[PDB]
Each structure stands twice: as C-alpha cells, then as structure tokens.
Chain A
Amino acid sequence: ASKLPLVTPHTQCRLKLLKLERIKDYLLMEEEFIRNQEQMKPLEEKQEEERSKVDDLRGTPMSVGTLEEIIDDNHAIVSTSVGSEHYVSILSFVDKDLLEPGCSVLLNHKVHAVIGVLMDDTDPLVTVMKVEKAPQETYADIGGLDNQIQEIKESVELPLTHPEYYEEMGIKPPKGVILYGPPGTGKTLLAKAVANQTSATFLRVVGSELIQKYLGDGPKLVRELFRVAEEHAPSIVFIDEIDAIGTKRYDSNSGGEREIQRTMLELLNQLDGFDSRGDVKVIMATNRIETLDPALIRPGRIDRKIEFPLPDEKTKKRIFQIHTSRMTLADDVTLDDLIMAKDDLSGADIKAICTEAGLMALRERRMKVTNEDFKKSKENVLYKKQEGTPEGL
C-alpha cells in the first residue's frame, strides 16, 4: 500500500534485512499510537459528518459528464451529455489518480465542478482474447517434449516465479519465443499449457483475424492488443498462425497485401521499437517459418526459437496412452503393433485415430474398443494423404 522501496541490494542480504526491520518498527510505533488514540477517542463521529459536508457540496442531482482535457492545474473541460463544453473547477475531494481524458466524470448540477468519477466496463477486448484455464488439460496431458517445455518454462514462467536469478546477474529475460515446426506437433498446446499454468493475463489471437476489410483496422487491432497488455500487469501474447500475416514481404504484389505489410510493420514496431515494451512477453507459432520476414524474427524481437519435431518411436506410445486413457479397451489391443509402423504419424493424427476408433466402437454398440477397430481406424485416417507416389521419389 504505497510503501517505501528498500533499495538495498534487493537480494537476500543484511542491508535488505535492516532496511525492512526499520520499516517494520516504524509501522509498529504507528500502530501502537493509533490504537492508543482509538481507545482514547473513537473519532467515528468526527470522521463522519465529513461525508455529510461533502454530500452537501455535491448536490443530489449529480450529472455524469465526460472529461475531455485536464489543464494540469485542478481545472478541466467537462462535456455534458448533449455535447456542450464547459470549463469547470476540480474540487479537492476527487481522487485525481482516477482522472484521465475520456473518464465519466460526475459534475455538479448548477456549477458542473468536477466532484467524482465512475468505473467503466472491463471489456474493450479483455474478455474476447483472454483464454482463462485451458479446457483441454494441464502439463499432465503433454508428454515427449521435456526439453521444449523446459525452454518455455525458463523463457516465460521462470522470470515471473523467481526474478532473483535473472536479477542477480543483470540480464533481462529473453524477449519472445517463436514456436516453429511441422503441422500437428504441439505448439498451440504447449502455449495453452504455459498459459493455464502461469499467473499473468494470457491473450491469444489468430493471424487471419488481423486481416481486416476496412483500411487501417488491422494496425488499430494490433495497437490495441498491445495496449491492453500493459494495463494488465505481467501479460503474455500468443499470435498463432502468424504466417498468414507475416510473410517474406515480396514487393511485387498488389491488392490487400499492402495492408498486410503495414500491419506487419505495426507489430514489428510494437515488439521492439522506440518505447520500452514494459512487462509483456510475446509467443508466436508458425507451421511454415522459412517464409517469415527477417525483421520480425530477428534477435532482439524473438530471441528464442524452438523447433518441434514429430514423435519418433516412444512419444508415440506416450501420446497414444494419453488419448486412449479414457476408454474401455478390449484386452487384445496391440498398441505397439499400431506404433511400430514408421508411418510418420503426427500428434493430431494420433488424436484423430483415437477419436475415430472410439466413434466406430460406439457405432457397433460394443461396450469396449477392439484392436481390429484401432487398426481399421488407422488405415482410414492415413487414407487422407494422397499425392503423387512415384513423383519426387
């Protein structure tokens, strides 16, 4: 509560202890004196009747205007609802920490002098982007990464948990992490996990959702997205499928691609530009990364870059037992027989196989899922490969 900063080494030390013991001891003297005074006299009556004088000054028909410019000197220009513009005096009881242009101010009826402010809605965009807890699962449902999860934890979680480590040595955390790899490999899932596990406000956006059909709306959207992230303490932003917005930036192009490039420039400035980004982190994903712009994924914008390989032989077993976890299976399930094949299966492919097998098991009324069903489902899912066989090989 607006307490003093010790500004000793800030790391466990004897000076941090003595500057700390001192504030505690002063608070102790203050508390003792206050308790003595309260016992000696309640002062409830005196503290009261100040509310009465205030409410006397602010008449009953208080008017909700809209502040529009503070002259910096206990004066203001407050606009009444109709649209008129008055130049009123700011009184002494208004908490000035709450006065910024555009705030719904509470004016006097006969004199329009500012006498209070009101709260506003919390959903410019906060609700629509924040994801809350991930319905899928926690870190439990993710297996096989181990190293990647460790990287992300150090990049985004560890700087929140124990700042002392980074602080001790004078190095700030990395700026942003870009998750890149073949489709269906665990990018969005790991971001979801590090979101639902940490203690900041995690915001998610799709790149195609920044392609706007009015000019100068994409840049506005990105500017806002990075505007309500410093209003909210530590924050994380994850711009998924960025490829749809950040591309190689070929100049020989016509149409709305120019607007795409212009929003890309706005983002490129937000991440690392003139001003200090405050306390926010940026995660990104891209199935295809060779096509990003050099200035977006350059070192000071995205320090960490993470590859995401497919499950090889055993992570396949882990994922399979993760998705088959909740289903009654017959005692003939030759799971390895399904895994041993070097079919280059992907994680999303494993989920598809599990769901399809479960669904046909439901179709046949059978209380349990059989190995034959899983193999048939595997054949069916892989059926969505196509392409020209001899060609290219």
Chain B
Amino acid sequence: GSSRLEGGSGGDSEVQRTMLELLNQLDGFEATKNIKVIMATNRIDILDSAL
C-alpha cells in the first residue's frame, strides 16, 4: 500500500486491491470479538494513513 491511487492505476493495482480487501475485512467485524490485529512496520512514515 502506502496509498490507494499512487501510480495512476485507478485503484486496480494488485498492491491496492490487497489493501482494499484488508480494509473491508477490518471493517467486517466488531470491537467486541476478541480478535486483535497486530501490525508491524520498520518505516512508519511511508505507512498508509487509511489504516
């Protein structure tokens, strides 16, 4: 990721389709589900803000 329209693809890049599916899944379930998604990065700033 790092953005949803980055290389002019129009949201059809695979790197962006994976991020879209991850966002849909994260919004799928409720806070009260004892399912916490821990995410890691060695470079915070590049990291996308839509997460």
Contacts and interface: CB of A to CB of B under 8 A. Distances in A.
Contact present between A and B (CB < 8 A): yes
Interface of A: 123-125, 127-128, 209, 212-214, 217, 220-221, 224
B16 to A, nearest CB: 8
Given A123-B12, A127-B11, A209-B4, 9 more contacts: A124-B10, A125-B10, A128-B11, A128-B20, A212-B5, A213-B6, A213-B7, A214-B8, A221-B10
B19 to A, nearest CB: 10
Contacts of A128: 4-5, 11, 20
A236 to B, nearest CB: 19
Interface residues of B, number: 10
Contacts of A127: 11, 20
Contact of B3 (A124, A125, A209, A217): A209
A209 B6 CA distance: 8
Interface of B: 3-8, 10-12, 20
A128 B20 CA distance: 8
7 contacts: A124-B10, A127-B20, A128-B4, A212-B8, A213-B6, A213-B7, A221-B8
Nearest to A208: B3
A152 B10 CA distance: 30
B11 A221 contact: no
Contacts of B6: 213
Contacts of B8: 212, 214, 217, 220-221
B10 A224 contact: yes
Contacts of B4: 128, 209
B11 A125 contact: yes
A214 B7 contact: yes
A355 to B, nearest CB: 15
Contacts of A220: 8
Contacts of B5: 128, 209, 212, 221
Nearest to B24: A127
Nearest to A214: B8
Interface centre among B4, B7, B8 (most CB of A within 10 A): B8
B31 to A, nearest CB: 12
Contacts of B11: 123-125, 127-128
User: Which has the most chain A C-beta neighbours within 10 Å: B5, B6, B10, B11?
Assistant: B5
A124 B10 CA distance: 7
A110 to B, nearest CB: 35
- Residue among A123, A128, A214 having the largest count of chain B Cβ atoms under 10 Å: A128
Which 10 pairs from chain A and chain B are nearest by CB? Answer: A217-B8, A128-B11, A125-B11, A125-B10, A214-B8, A212-B8, A209-B5, A128-B4, A124-B10, A221-B5
A213 to B, nearest CB: 7
Nearest to B17: A123
Nearest to A209: B5
B7 to A, nearest CB: 7
